[PDB]
Amino acid sequence: RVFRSADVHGDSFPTNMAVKFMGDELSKLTGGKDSIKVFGNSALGSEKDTVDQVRIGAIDMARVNGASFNEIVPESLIPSFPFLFRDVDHFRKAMYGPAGQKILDAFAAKGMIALTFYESGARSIYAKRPVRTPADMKGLKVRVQPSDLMVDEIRAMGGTPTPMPFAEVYTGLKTGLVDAAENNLPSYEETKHFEVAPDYSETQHAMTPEVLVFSKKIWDTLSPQEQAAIRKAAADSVPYYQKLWTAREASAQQAVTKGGANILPAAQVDRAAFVKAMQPLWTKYEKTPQMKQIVDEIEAT
Numbered sequence: 697r698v699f700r701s702a703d704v705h706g707d708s709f710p711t712n713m714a715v716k717f718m719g720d721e722l723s724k725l726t727g728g729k730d731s732i733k734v735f736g737n738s739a740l741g742s743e744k745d746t747v748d749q750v751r752i753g754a755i756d757m758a759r760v761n762g763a764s765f766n767e768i769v770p771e772s773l774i775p776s777f778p779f780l781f782r783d784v785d786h787f788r789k790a791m792y793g794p795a796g797q798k799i800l801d802a803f804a805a806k807g808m809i810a811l812t813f814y815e816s817g818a819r820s821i822y823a824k825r826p827v828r829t830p831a832d833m834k835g836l837k838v839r840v841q842p843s844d845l846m847v848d849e850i851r852a853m854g855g856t857p858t859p860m861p862f863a864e865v866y867t868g869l870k871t872g873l874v875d876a877a878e879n880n881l882p883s884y885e886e887t888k889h890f891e892v893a894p895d896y897s898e899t900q901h902a903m904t905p906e907v908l909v910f911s912k913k914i915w916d917t918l919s920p921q922e923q924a925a926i927r928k929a930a931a932d933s934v935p936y937y938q939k940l941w942t943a944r945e946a947s948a949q950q951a952v953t954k955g956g957a958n959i960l961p962a963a964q965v966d967r968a969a970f971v972k973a974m975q976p977l978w979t980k981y982e983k984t985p986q987m988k989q990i991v992d993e994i995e996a997t
């Protein structure tokens with residue numbers, strides 16, 4: 697049947713496109729039994745709300761950021777840890793390997809089947825002034841996702857964190873409720889945040905993944921063959937997503953720069969000042985030997 701899936705991004709965004717592709721692939725594998733419709737633009741609710749809905753079986757699927765599980769699935773904290781991944785190649789090798797699998801596995805006890813990760817580049821601060829160091833962060837009202845870890849990350853960077861839904865951030869910046877936020881370049885572009893917060897400073901403080909989750913209540917009513925079809929379609933969507941995403945990182949950078957944004961490259965940012973300040977959070981959020989082991993498996997990749 698038609699599975700309903702949520703996304704905060706617009707229809708043309710790579711996450712929406714990848715799950716629509718998954719849906720097309722899935723309909724074939726199931727002899728037309730199944731397809732997916734993606735409701736974008738936060739139509740079904742904030743990310744938080746849609747995760748609640750997936751967990752109770754009110755919607756079938758959601759494509760959400762890892763941060764949105766940080767208070768539900770402890771293992772989801774790990775890939776949001778600051779400066780955990782060395783670069784994108786490290787993210788890919790670790791997150792599509794056994795370490796990433798252990799993180800996906802942890803979702804089942806909380807009513808969700810985590811089918812796949814998608815990469816989300818690196819999140820960086822943007823604002824109305826450049827940011828090279830924490831002193832530069834001091835005084836900024838910085839929107840964060842509603843995650844205790846992300847609140848702590850931005851506080852350690854020196855900003856004053858304020859949680860808000862993604863859809864509300866643009867107006868928050870345009871009207872001065874907040875002075876800053878953080879995200880990857882494609883999101884900075886899509887939302888037009890770059891028009892009102894033109895200084896994008898490559899702090900690259902997190903490389904949090906996206907996660908595609910399926911309601912376990914619904915999943916549990918499916919046959920092993922249907923389940924295997926859905927898992928195959930999700931896996932097959934990843935190289936498709938990666939083609940779109942890598943192109944979008946490049947096009948977003950050019951578009952925001954053409955549109956007046958000033959990107960401060962990572963090399964000019966004192967990752968030094970940010971790394972030593974944020975590291976302790978790893979120890980704070982390592983809540984089990986299992987989490988410690990996952991972090992270790994990631995680092996050893």
Ligand SMILES: O=C(O)[C@H]1O[C@@H](O)[C@H](O)[C@@H](O)[C@H]1O
Pocket residue numbers: 704743759760761763816841861862878879880883906
């Ligand atoms: O900051 C946000 O709220 C958003 O960040 C984006 O990178 C992510 O794709 C979204 O799912 C959402 O979490």
Ligand SMILES: [Ca+2]
Pocket residue numbers: 748
């Ligand atoms: Ca809640």
Ligand SMILES: [Ca+2]
Pocket residue numbers: 988991992
């Ligand atoms: Ca360790």
Ligand SMILES: [Cl-]
Pocket residue numbers: 704742743744860861862863
């Ligand atoms: Cl949201």
